[PDB]
Amino acid sequence: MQMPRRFNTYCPHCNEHQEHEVEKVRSGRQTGMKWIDRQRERNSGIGNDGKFSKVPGGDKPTKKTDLKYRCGECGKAHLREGWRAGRLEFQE
Amino acid sequence: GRRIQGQRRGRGTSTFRAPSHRYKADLEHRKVEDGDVIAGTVVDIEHDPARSAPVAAVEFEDGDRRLILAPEGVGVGDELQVGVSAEIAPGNTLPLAEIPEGVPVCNVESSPGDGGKFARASGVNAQLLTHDRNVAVVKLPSGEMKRLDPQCRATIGVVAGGGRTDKPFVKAGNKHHKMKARGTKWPNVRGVAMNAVDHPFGGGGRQHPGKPKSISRNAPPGRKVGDIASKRTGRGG
Amino acid sequence: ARSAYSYIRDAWENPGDGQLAELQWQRQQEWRNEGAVERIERPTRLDKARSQGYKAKQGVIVARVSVRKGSARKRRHKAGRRSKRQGVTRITRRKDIQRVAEERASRTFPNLRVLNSYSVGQDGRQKWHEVILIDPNHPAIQNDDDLSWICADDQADRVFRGLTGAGRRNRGLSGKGKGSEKTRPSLRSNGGKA
Amino acid sequence: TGAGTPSQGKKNTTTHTKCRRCGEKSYHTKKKVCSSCGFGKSAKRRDYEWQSKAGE
RNA sequence: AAACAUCUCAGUAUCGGGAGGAACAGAAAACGCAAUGUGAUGUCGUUAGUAACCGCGAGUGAACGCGAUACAGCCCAAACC
RNA sequence: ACUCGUACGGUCACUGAAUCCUGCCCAGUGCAGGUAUCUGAACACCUCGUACAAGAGGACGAAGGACCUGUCAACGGCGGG
RNA sequence: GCUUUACUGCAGGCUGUCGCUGAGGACUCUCACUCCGGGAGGAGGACACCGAUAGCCGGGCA
Ligand SMILES: [Cl-]
Ligand SMILES: [Cl-]
Ligand SMILES: [Cl-]
Ligand SMILES: [Cl-]
Ligand SMILES: [K+]
Ligand SMILES: [Mg+2]
Ligand SMILES: [Mg+2]
Ligand SMILES: [Mg+2]
Ligand SMILES: [Mg+2]
Ligand SMILES: [Mg+2]
Ligand SMILES: [Mg+2]
Ligand SMILES: [Mg+2]
Ligand SMILES: [Mg+2]
Ligand SMILES: [Mg+2]
Ligand SMILES: [Mg+2]
Ligand SMILES: [Mg+2]
Ligand SMILES: [Mg+2]
Ligand SMILES: [Mg+2]
Ligand SMILES: [Mg+2]
Ligand SMILES: [Mg+2]
Ligand SMILES: [Mg+2]
Ligand SMILES: [Mg+2]
Ligand SMILES: [Mg+2]
Ligand code: NA
Ligand code: NA
Ligand code: NA
Ligand code: NA
Ligand code: NA
Ligand code: NA
Ligand code: NA
Ligand code: NA
Ligand code: NA
Ligand code: NA
Ligand code: NA
């Protein structure tokens, strides 16, 4: 589907309607220092490593919308529930 | 499954061992302090159970009686010599260096003084081709060019008993008798005639190998069977 | 002023440097030809020996023991095992090489008792340790106020029961506080979890 | 040939005999080892924890 | 664990080596109710199924302290001779 | 162990006396050889990060793989129109 | 019990790296180490072996 790059809507921070900019959430890089990262190293040994021996699940036919809504004035963003969309493109 | 036959071998049980106690002598060159003054006389020509070829008993000037790898054309009474100054005649042993090229040799040492390793079976021979103050190129019966230390001692002539392979065994019984003198399990059952549990080629409603016969060099024992690391197969091409 | 002993010690802090280096490069050659347990007239590290209880005296013996380097020499499983227990290559023993050495020595001298031991180096495939043993039956020792303690019946085969210094550290008994919940008073009384 | 009764006829070989150490007829005269006390194999007397129930 | 691989059964069964009438431990490079505080070590009661672990599933699981029992504190190496 | 052995050896396989013979197929799988370029781990090395460290990235790149070739008395195949 | 391009692992083989390990991306040497030689000495040589680790293959085995 199609979607405006910018549009007016409520900003939960300003507590008043303003122009927001919509953008897709770019994945952040892991640090490899979270507790789970330490358990992986600690608990993996000789033989099967339980949960750590498992591999990536799969894919649903269509993914939900993963967007960031940035308030055009206060500069802060907020998240919204997403909806299934085979494809999502912005207008301007 | 069960360990394959090739694996039972290594344990060295009776069935796989050679009848060592029935063997005569470990054919090796003599150890001369130096000089060559070492000569002996052929006293008798005996049969060597370990090689199916003749061997000669020799008495040396210094009272030493030892069997020796007999080349073709050596008779009782003949005088043999072993040393740097050895004469250049059949049956004499001397370092590759002192040997003239184009002369067939047998029982060649891989390392000077190791007693001889190459060219020792019925009728085979090595061919000394090149010399040098360093390398002595010899052509072994397999056809390979082997660079050797000229100080390596060898014996002039081709090994006795040549042509043994020309006559067919004709019957199982003959194979049997020869086999009994070797460290070998015989007769041979085909893998494909076995059960899955006994060999990688076993099993099936009919006999045929399960997979392709060419196996990797890295294959483990219990699996390395069939055509080991074959660079090619068949006759074609 | 510094004791002469302090010099032997200071040298052994870097067995790979200086004169000690060249010295080892030479000795090991002879050592690699000696047996598994060689009795020696004098400790290679006097300061260490004396520090551990040694004494130029009757009934005091020293022996250099050689032991292979590396993990456990283990045979693979010949029956069903869950993946966790199918290992062979990474398994290491719970007894350190120094204790193995102390035991091989004590067995060689059935009448003697282990007093202590220390390292004297290693090449690429083995480690050497010098062990100090004592004759609990020689009167020269039964009358020594600083050693007669090892003469008591309850000190019999002390090395095989982990009562040695290396035996006690290896048993995780160094710490008196946190971390030694499953080690003291013994590994066995703590259900073998330390 | 039956592996039962007919094969029982060839049994006239003496193996296990009275043991010099323990007195049991378990001394294998071919192996010179007692299957009962370990004589010929061990200085210590043969014994195993499985010879009784684990808690006994 | 209603399958099963980590986990669990379990450091159990069993095996190798060894001591004693009891073993082992033991006079802090401790503790850390953080203190102007405690004062070798075992063990019993408790702390507590708590903290902690764990396909964070099923399961697993202490310690300090406290109340008791019994109490006991010493010898070398080196310096200088 | 083979081996008191050394290629006229002995190991690993297939077929199964003699006689007349044994065609076509290397795409897949296997084995083997080569390989500009691509891919390819760890240590050491370089950058960032951290008064250190975790960590992130880069350079280099072995066997192996991609890619190319040889091979069917190697697994096997020898159709529709 | 058996099979395999089922899942997960474990031996084994190949390969890199560190230790043993030394003198002057290609090279010489000798002194460790290895092998031949009864010995003198020869060959090989900082490699190989062995210890550690990493990648690949891996129903041979669980
Ligand atoms: Cl989206
Ligand atoms: Cl034959
Ligand atoms: Cl002892
Ligand atoms: Cl307190
Ligand atoms: K289990
Ligand atoms: Mg694992
Ligand atoms: Mg021989
Ligand atoms: Mg033939
Ligand atoms: Mg035979
Ligand atoms: Mg057959
Ligand atoms: Mg059948
Ligand atoms: Mg099979
Ligand atoms: Mg057939
Ligand atoms: Mg067939
Ligand atoms: Mg106790
Ligand atoms: Mg029966
Ligand atoms: Mg279950
Ligand atoms: Mg469950
Ligand atoms: Mg537990
Ligand atoms: Mg505590
Ligand atoms: Mg005093
Ligand atoms: Mg040798
Ligand atoms: Mg299976
Ligand atoms: Na851990
Ligand atoms: Na088959
Ligand atoms: Na002893
Ligand atoms: Na532990
Ligand atoms: Na169940
Ligand atoms: Na089941
Ligand atoms: Na778990
Ligand atoms: Na209190
Ligand atoms: Na093909
Ligand atoms: Na092909
Ligand atoms: Na079955």
mmCIF file with all atom_site columns, C-alpha atoms in Angstrom, chain D residues 5-56:
data_model
loop_
_atom_site.group_PDB
_atom_site.id
_atom_site.type_symbol
_atom_site.label_atom_id
_atom_site.label_alt_id
_atom_site.label_comp_id
_atom_site.label_asym_id
_atom_site.label_entity_id
_atom_site.label_seq_id
_atom_site.pdbx_PDB_ins_code
_atom_site.Cartn_x
_atom_site.Cartn_y
_atom_site.Cartn_z
_atom_site.occupancy
_atom_site.B_iso_or_equiv
_atom_site.pdbx_formal_charge
_atom_site.auth_seq_id
_atom_site.auth_comp_id
_atom_site.auth_asym_id
_atom_site.auth_atom_id
_atom_site.pdbx_PDB_model_num
ATOM 1  C CA . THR D 1 5  ? 23.075 -83.471 24.042 1.00 0.00 ? 5  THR D CA 1
ATOM 2  C CA . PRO D 1 6  ? 25.325 -84.688 21.229 1.00 0.00 ? 6  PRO D CA 1
ATOM 3  C CA . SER D 1 7  ? 27.840 -81.873 21.827 1.00 0.00 ? 7  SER D CA 1
ATOM 4  C CA . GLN D 1 8  ? 27.939 -82.686 25.550 1.00 0.00 ? 8  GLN D CA 1
ATOM 5  C CA . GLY D 1 9  ? 29.954 -85.823 24.856 1.00 0.00 ? 9  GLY D CA 1
ATOM 6  C CA . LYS D 1 10 ? 33.230 -84.062 24.119 1.00 0.00 ? 10 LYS D CA 1
ATOM 7  C CA . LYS D 1 11 ? 33.392 -82.521 27.560 1.00 0.00 ? 11 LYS D CA 1
ATOM 8  C CA . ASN D 1 12 ? 36.356 -84.219 29.242 1.00 0.00 ? 12 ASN D CA 1
ATOM 9  C CA . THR D 1 13 ? 38.719 -81.259 29.563 1.00 0.00 ? 13 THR D CA 1
ATOM 10 C CA . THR D 1 14 ? 39.729 -80.084 33.027 1.00 0.00 ? 14 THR D CA 1
ATOM 11 C CA . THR D 1 15 ? 39.754 -76.350 33.559 1.00 0.00 ? 15 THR D CA 1
ATOM 12 C CA . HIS D 1 16 ? 38.495 -75.139 36.974 1.00 0.00 ? 16 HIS D CA 1
ATOM 13 C CA . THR D 1 17 ? 40.131 -76.814 39.958 1.00 0.00 ? 17 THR D CA 1
ATOM 14 C CA . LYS D 1 18 ? 40.429 -76.515 43.731 1.00 0.00 ? 18 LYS D CA 1
ATOM 15 C CA . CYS D 1 19 ? 42.269 -73.291 44.471 1.00 0.00 ? 19 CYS D CA 1
ATOM 16 C CA . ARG D 1 20 ? 45.452 -73.256 46.531 1.00 0.00 ? 20 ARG D CA 1
ATOM 17 C CA . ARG D 1 21 ? 44.532 -69.834 47.929 1.00 0.00 ? 21 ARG D CA 1
ATOM 18 C CA . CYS D 1 22 ? 40.776 -69.918 48.639 1.00 0.00 ? 22 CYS D CA 1
ATOM 19 C CA . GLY D 1 23 ? 39.774 -73.567 48.456 1.00 0.00 ? 23 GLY D CA 1
ATOM 20 C CA . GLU D 1 24 ? 37.060 -73.028 45.858 1.00 0.00 ? 24 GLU D CA 1
ATOM 21 C CA . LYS D 1 25 ? 36.984 -75.209 42.740 1.00 0.00 ? 25 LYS D CA 1
ATOM 22 C CA . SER D 1 26 ? 37.503 -72.073 40.658 1.00 0.00 ? 26 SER D CA 1
ATOM 23 C CA . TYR D 1 27 ? 41.224 -72.222 39.827 1.00 0.00 ? 27 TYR D CA 1
ATOM 24 C CA . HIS D 1 28 ? 41.492 -72.316 36.034 1.00 0.00 ? 28 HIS D CA 1
ATOM 25 C CA . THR D 1 29 ? 44.320 -74.777 35.407 1.00 0.00 ? 29 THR D CA 1
ATOM 26 C CA . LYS D 1 30 ? 44.757 -73.535 31.826 1.00 0.00 ? 30 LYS D CA 1
ATOM 27 C CA . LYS D 1 31 ? 44.918 -69.840 32.781 1.00 0.00 ? 31 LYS D CA 1
ATOM 28 C CA . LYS D 1 32 ? 46.377 -70.403 36.257 1.00 0.00 ? 32 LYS D CA 1
ATOM 29 C CA . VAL D 1 33 ? 43.874 -67.862 37.629 1.00 0.00 ? 33 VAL D CA 1
ATOM 30 C CA . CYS D 1 34 ? 41.130 -68.305 40.214 1.00 0.00 ? 34 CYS D CA 1
ATOM 31 C CA . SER D 1 35 ? 37.783 -66.939 39.038 1.00 0.00 ? 35 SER D CA 1
ATOM 32 C CA . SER D 1 36 ? 36.717 -66.732 42.680 1.00 0.00 ? 36 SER D CA 1
ATOM 33 C CA . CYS D 1 37 ? 39.549 -65.084 44.689 1.00 0.00 ? 37 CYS D CA 1
ATOM 34 C CA . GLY D 1 38 ? 41.742 -63.693 41.917 1.00 0.00 ? 38 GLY D CA 1
ATOM 35 C CA . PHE D 1 39 ? 44.720 -65.897 42.758 1.00 0.00 ? 39 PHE D CA 1
ATOM 36 C CA . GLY D 1 40 ? 47.307 -65.769 39.975 1.00 0.00 ? 40 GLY D CA 1
ATOM 37 C CA . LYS D 1 41 ? 46.029 -62.394 38.878 1.00 0.00 ? 41 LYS D CA 1
ATOM 38 C CA . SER D 1 42 ? 45.940 -60.266 42.011 1.00 0.00 ? 42 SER D CA 1
ATOM 39 C CA . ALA D 1 43 ? 47.795 -60.085 45.308 1.00 0.00 ? 43 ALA D CA 1
ATOM 40 C CA . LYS D 1 44 ? 44.596 -58.581 46.746 1.00 0.00 ? 44 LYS D CA 1
ATOM 41 C CA . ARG D 1 45 ? 41.549 -60.821 47.135 1.00 0.00 ? 45 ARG D CA 1
ATOM 42 C CA . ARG D 1 46 ? 38.952 -60.494 44.345 1.00 0.00 ? 46 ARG D CA 1
ATOM 43 C CA . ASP D 1 47 ? 35.897 -58.575 45.506 1.00 0.00 ? 47 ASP D CA 1
ATOM 44 C CA . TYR D 1 48 ? 33.229 -56.320 43.989 1.00 0.00 ? 48 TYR D CA 1
ATOM 45 C CA . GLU D 1 49 ? 30.530 -54.039 45.346 1.00 0.00 ? 49 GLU D CA 1
ATOM 46 C CA . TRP D 1 50 ? 28.029 -55.624 42.976 1.00 0.00 ? 50 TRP D CA 1
ATOM 47 C CA . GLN D 1 51 ? 28.239 -58.886 44.944 1.00 0.00 ? 51 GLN D CA 1
ATOM 48 C CA . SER D 1 52 ? 25.483 -57.461 47.125 1.00 0.00 ? 52 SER D CA 1
ATOM 49 C CA . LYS D 1 53 ? 22.675 -54.901 46.930 1.00 0.00 ? 53 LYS D CA 1
ATOM 50 C CA . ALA D 1 54 ? 23.889 -51.309 46.649 1.00 0.00 ? 54 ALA D CA 1
ATOM 51 C CA . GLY D 1 55 ? 22.614 -50.171 50.043 1.00 0.00 ? 55 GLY D CA 1
ATOM 52 C CA . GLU D 1 56 ? 23.761 -53.347 51.729 1.00 0.00 ? 56 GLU D CA 1
#
